Amino acid sequence: SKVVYVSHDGTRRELDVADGVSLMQAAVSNGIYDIVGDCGGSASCATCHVYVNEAFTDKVPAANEREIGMLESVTAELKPNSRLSCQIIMTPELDGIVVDVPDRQW
Ligand code: FES
């Protein structure tokens, strides 16, 4: 399934992500270092922060308590559509989803 990562400078990168893989795993596995899973993907850091395109913000599963609490630690601006990419798990239903990588993760 397709996932589009948009850098701060507008650079777009499209990856084919398998079912069950998180957006953080796909990013780090394909050189999108601007996203770094410091904690390893267990919602214990905020370095995998991304902005889910408003066209998918209400499709993807809502953030749980752990994520909501960890989001307050993001270094970039915390927007309404801010999410931790390690919490977004790919499925065919998310094909075409677009996420913007923040200017910084620290
Ligand atoms: S990789 Fe640590 S919260 Fe996502």
Curated annotation (Swiss-Prot):
Source organism of this protein record: Pseudomonas putida
Gene: camB
Keywords from the named record: 2Fe-2S, Electron transport, Iron, Iron-sulfur, Metal-binding, Transport
Annotated residues for binding of [2Fe-2S] cluster: C39, C45, C48, C86
GO molecular function: 2 iron, 2 sulfur cluster binding; electron transfer activity; metal ion binding
The protein's name: Putidaredoxin
One Gene Ontology cellular component: cytosol
UniProt family annotation: Belongs to the adrenodoxin/putidaredoxin family.
Keyword Metal-binding found: yes
CC cofactor: [2Fe-2S] cluster
Function of the molecule: The oxidation of camphor by cytochrome P450-CAM requires the participation of a flavoprotein, putidaredoxin reductase, and an iron-sulfur protein, putidaredoxin, to mediate the transfer of electrons from NADH to P450 for oxygen activation.
One GO process term, biological-process aspect: P450-containing electron transport chain
InterPro entries xrefs: 2Fe-2S_ferredoxin-like_sf, 2Fe-2S_ferredoxin-type, Adrenodoxin-like, Adrenodoxin_Fe-S_BS, Beta-grasp_dom_sf
Cofactor info, note text: Binds 1 [2Fe-2S] cluster.
Record-annotated 2Fe-2S ferredoxin-type domain positions: 1-105
